[PDB]
Write a protein that binds this ligand. Structure first.
Ligand SMILES: O=C(CC[C@@H](c1ccccc1)P(=O)(O)O)N(O)CCCCCc1ccccc1
Ligand SMILES: O=C(CC[C@@H](c1ccccc1)P(=O)(O)O)N(O)CCCCCc1ccccc1
Ligand SMILES: [Ca+2]
Ligand SMILES: [Ca+2]
Ligand SMILES: [Ca+2]
Ligand SMILES: [Mn+2]
Ligand SMILES: [Mn+2]
Lengths: 407, 411
């Protein structure tokens, strides 16, 4: 019977890629029902998407465009959706028995809260939002132990790759973010592939003076800066640890400039399995919705002969010290990942806005990490989410204070 | 608790690699019990293996060294194995309730017959003998339909790779050589990787001149003579295309040969969503063998971890069919079906050996094979399993004789 889907952040990158692959797949046979759309504040696009997909639920976060939305939707003949607003609408969608799978394609607070409510409702959650895993991994783990039928399915491309390499007869004995995931799946080590970003050929003296322009000039600005500093991969290392329970000494970052091998899993016998395709978000999103099955697509087949050459090299931790900081934070454990994520949000934005230099990014983050003290990890879910929010806010303030002191 | 294993061809490449990985895996826990070792005629080597592993059963095919084996084994104290010979010995081993899984590391008739008996006794058959599959594919499918608990698990490195790339949640719902395997596993296409052999970069003028010594000498990877010649002509890959078809029920138009000269990626599967999964490692027989014996599980090894950064570069290209016409012949034979794969295999056996022995030139190999294929007239497929085996053997013998006759004439 159908796959019933809600998209949170439907006008974002994840959201439109999801709707694209759904639409295309549905042309081949009707497998997907788009039951709910949720957007922040693109009331117009949401209306356009509603025309096409006609979900039972519409929701917009911003109350200031709530009335407008309702007014635009009247124009659609033969259509009486449930139209909702804000956090309250979010919760209603997540509690709907008609929804099976929820795509989280929003970031930050909205991202963690929708994820939380989707888990509390025992749904399958297709999560792209790595910062929520890095920052609030312990909270997600606890929730997933309370809500036994909820599952997080990874959509971040490298993590999708890893997941796609597994035997689902073993996956089904566990789930992502569970202790012992790697043990049950016989995983030994992970090769986490990277584009390497724009600065792999730059000397230290060149990196000293690179600018945000040099990094941007195709994805969002924040992830683009993180790809430039390789803090994206550093966050993706922590994401791997949490999703798959792989030790940090068994995660290896490898620079694969062609971006065809998306990542690789070494099993305990030392056999390596990898997932490969053109650089792509459609397959990761689609697999999150079809797992543990696959369905036909009309995607272009990989032409391995035409690709011709694949290359792999080790990243320099001197040139990309954000990688080292991510490992350090993850190995220290506790809430150090929360602090890393929060301090990077500030340092990334400073650099983006030409306030600091490349090596200042890692300097600031390092100084924030050094000032944090491990805290007792709460057993209680509500207390734990509070600790994470408090630490997150502290680390942002601290990063800002270190910036302002030097400046 | 322990997996009880028989090894057919224990002193060949597959056999020696099997006992090496088994030994390592057995260091602490009793993971495997080596219950039976069989060889064709290497009686001295089998004795030495018997000393170490002390299997319940020993068997030599060559009855002329049966007495020598019994006399060597009397040297081993507090050991009273069952010592057998010939096809009767093969049959007794395959029939033993004390055996769970059988590694077939022997070729030609002994490979086919041991495979057959192993299936007829509902065993797990870890099959490295690709020629059995090419020659007797439909017969094996029929036997596997009769003996419902038997399984063929592939050991040929590329086929092991394909198998590993599949999702075992689907694999467990079917089995190799079963109709609908590719549908159940959501397979779209196979990239069947090849080393490309020693002659991959030769011009046509250069290639006309090659000899067996050129194929055999300073080889990157040292293997048996027959397979080394087939790697050189890429008939090995042609056989492996047919092997892929039969193991995985993949259509010939959905099997693509790719020359990957680094031999790290061992083969790839494209699923119906166009996602591709590959299996990679150093060139290696230990993981394929081990996985055939542990599937659907994996166990710890102390093999060297792949260092992808050190490998640094992986390359892919399409082989030239003008330079490697054996590939074309294999596809043609497979697509024709019937007993054309049997004929391809038998004629190649002859042509390979003529070239090995310096009696014909490189392009004469494919010429002879093609002439035998064109000579063969399709036959009604026997419905009875025993009739079908007898038909296969008749056609195999005919094709070898026809190849020899062609050589004799143009000579
Ligand atoms: O984390 C990421 C972005 C950062 C990593 C990266 C960058 C570039 C290619 C591959 C990977 P990084 O290794 O530099 O840190 N992904 O998961 C890539 C997803 C999108 C790739 C395809 C696509 C579709 C549309 C626009 C643009 C791209
Ligand atoms: O069919 C084959 C041999 C032919 C193919 C080949 C040749 C060379 C490397 C890889 C592949 P082909 O592509 O040229 O036809 N395999 O499956 C060989 C796999 C294990 C080779 C490594 C090894 C381990 C132990 C002893 C000796 C060697
Ligand atoms: Ca004798
Ligand atoms: Ca698998
Ligand atoms: Ca097809
Ligand atoms: Mn990513
Ligand atoms: Mn092979």
């Amino acid at each position: 019977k159908p796959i019933n889907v809600a998209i949170f952040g439907s006008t974002g990158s994840i959201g439109t890629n999801a709707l694209n692959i759904i639409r295309e797949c549905n042309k081949i046979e009707n497998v997907f029902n788009v039951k709910a759309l949720y957007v922040n504040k693109s009331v117009n696009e949401l209306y356009e998407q509603a025309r096409e997909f006609l979900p039972e639920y519409l929701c917009i976060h911003d109350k200031s465009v709530y009335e407008e939305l309702k007014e635009l939707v009247k124009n659609i003949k033969d259509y009486k959706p449930i139209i909702l607003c804000g956090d309250e609408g979010m919760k209603e969608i997540c509690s709907s028995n008609s929804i099976d799978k929820i795509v989280i394609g929003i970031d930050s607070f909205q991202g963690l809260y929708s994820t939380m409510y989707a888990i509390m409702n025992n749904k399958i959650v297709a999560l792209a939002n790595k910062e929520s895993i890095v920052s609030a991994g312990f909270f997600l783990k606890k929730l997933l132990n309370i809500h036994k039928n909820a599952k997080i399915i990874p959509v971040d491309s490298e993590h999708s790759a890893i997941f796609q390499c597994l035997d689902n007869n073993k996956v089904l004995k566990t789930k992502c973010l569970q202790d012992n995931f790697s043990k049950i799946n016989n995983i030994n080590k992970i090769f986490l592939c990277s584009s390497g970003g724009p600065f792999q050929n730059l000397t230290m003296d060149e990196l000293k003076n690179v600018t945000s322009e040099n990094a941007l000039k195709k994805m969002g600005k924040k992830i683009t800066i993180d790809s430039a500093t390789m803090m994206n991969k550093g966050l993706e290392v922590i994401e791997t640890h949490f999703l798959f329970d792989v030790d940090y000494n068994d995660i290896e970052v490898i620079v694969h400039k062609e971006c065809i091998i998306h990542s690789c899993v070494e099993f305990i016998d030392k056999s390596v399995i990898s997932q490969m395709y053109y650089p792509d978000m459609q397959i990761p999103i689609l697999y999150s919705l079809t797992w543990p099955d696959r369905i036909k697509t009309n995607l272009k087949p990989l032409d391995l002969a035409q690709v011709s050459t694949l290359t792999f090299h080790k990243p320099s931790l001197e040139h990309f010290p954000c990688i080292k900081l991510a490992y350090q934070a993850g190995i220290k454990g506790n809430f150090y990942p929360t602090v890393l994520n929060a301090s990077n949000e500030i340092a990334n934005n400073l650099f983006l806005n030409n306030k600091i230099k490349y090596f200042d990014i890692s300097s600031i983050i390092s100084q924030v990490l050094e000032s944090f003290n491990s805290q007792k990890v709460s057993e209680n879910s509500e207390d734990l989410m509070k600790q994470i929010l408090q630490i997150h806010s502290w680390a942002k303030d601290k990063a800002t204070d270190i910036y302002n002191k030097h400046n």
